[model samples]
Target: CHPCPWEWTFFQGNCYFMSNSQRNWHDSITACKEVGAQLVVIKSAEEQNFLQLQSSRSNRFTWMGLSDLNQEGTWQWVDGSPLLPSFKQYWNRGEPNNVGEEDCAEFSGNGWNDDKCNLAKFWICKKSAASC
Candidate 1:
């Protein structure tokens, strides 16, 4: 097992950390990669449930493992994996709205919502396979 200060777990093919702090989408993304990660990538329903449990009963927003800054309408997990067009379960109205300026996407409590890539919020961190 990999040793670290935080409770790092090797799930799927990467190391992950549940966020204890809030930050904007880009900041959080940068932060994760800075720590040898690329934001937590949810690969299964189990992972999604794991994330939902991290939120408080009243909590309503958090960042997910998705983004489209590199290219509009081209959504991909931080790991460079394609997100199933039918597998996305969380998003707000007009979202991904791709309103031309909207690029970052975050999980708002119950589901995903497109927010400013710079909007700060709590997030989960994911480490690339090489880092592990």
Candidate 2:
């Protein structure tokens, strides 16, 4: 099936939109909501690989839906789903430190990094697509 919007790319059962413009974590979430989608959430190694591949091409830190902003050390997806202990997280060394009041998560070349949510960065959005 094809994605409704030409710019959206299809993967698995979802349609993804990786923004070229940058936005803060909060604004990024709002932007995704504006399109009836949510920030991208990595659910498996395959998904991680897909995002990593995309990020490598952009050479930009892309925000993921993962964050612990509401409660330190308690990461959750934008959908409010708790991140399971066994979940595959590609965090950089000593990451999620909540460093400098860091609360947002982004995919860097090294892996996932917890950074200040207010910092603007590129982002990915995803949602289920209707069958063509």
Candidate 3:
């Protein structure tokens, strides 16, 4: 079994941490980086499911590692890779509408929303088990 920190959970060879306090998307990402992790990046349905579970339990808006800040309508991961066309999106109804600087992504009540990056929100962090 992977050894995760006291509050973190181990799954699929990675360690995931759900923040107890809210922070803006950029600050949250920086906080994750400080700990050698990054904002959660969904790689598959299973990973999404796990994240959804955590979000549901916390009942809070959760920052996700997705954004189109560099280019409108060109969403990409934190690692600078384009979002795959085939990848499943959890966007809520009428979301990603790009309404005035809404470039960052967040999940709330089981679906994703394009939100302002400056709004503070709870977040999740993830890193390889070895890095944990």
Candidate 4:
């Protein structure tokens, strides 16, 4: 417990965490903001690789800095930055299928998937500001 605290992770340039609590897309976003973070921000390939290594191996899926709350195909990073077309991590069977009312995005190393916003999973989180 001392090594890796509950809901917390340390990474270069930022600290990461997964919410111990579950929430919908908006709620989760709000929660991360309340904690001074805007969900997980993966700005580079190294960050993405780190996240993929840290997430669940079972589903191999973990929440990242992507979300599409409006049901639109446009995936926006938590910081409101647009995801570049080249940075897309698409899921199999084609992506953004919007299957089962999924309105949010998550990463699974191989690709991305849109799942129900409320589904509780260990989310990948990053700190927005430097540590106090």
User: What is the model-wide C-alpha lDDT for candidate 4?
Assistant: 0.67
The window of 10 residues in a row where model 4 has the poorest summed lDDT is 1-10
Off by over 4 Å in 1: 1-4, 7-15, 56-60, 92-94, 127-132
Error of 4 at 1 (Å): 18
What is the Å distance of residue 5 in model 2 from its true position? Answer: 1.6
Q: Tens digit of lDDT per residue, candidate 3, span 1-132?
A: 437877898888888989999999899899999999999888878888888887887899999999999999888989777777665467888877988789999887878888999999998999988642
Clashes of each: 8, 0, 0, 0
Scored by TM-score, the top model is 2
Query: Which pairs of residues have clashing backbones in candidate 1?
Result: 23-120, 23-121, 24-119, 24-120, 60-109, 90-112, 91-112, 94-97
Residue 55 lDDT, candidate 1, scale 0-100? 45
True-structure lDDT of candidate 3: 0.86
TM-score of 4: 0.75
Candidate 1 on 89-127: residue-level lDDT in tens?
655555668664767767666666777777778777876
TM of each candidate vs. truth: 0.71, 0.92, 0.91, 0.75
Tens digits of per-residue lDDT, candidate 2, 2-42, equal: 65567988788888899989999999999999999999977
For TM-score, candidate 1 versus 3, the one ahead is 3
State candidate 1's TM-score. 0.71
Q: Which 10 consecutive positions of candidate 1 have the poorest summed lDDT?
A: 1-10
RMSD of 3: 2.1
Candidate 1, position 65, lDDT: 70
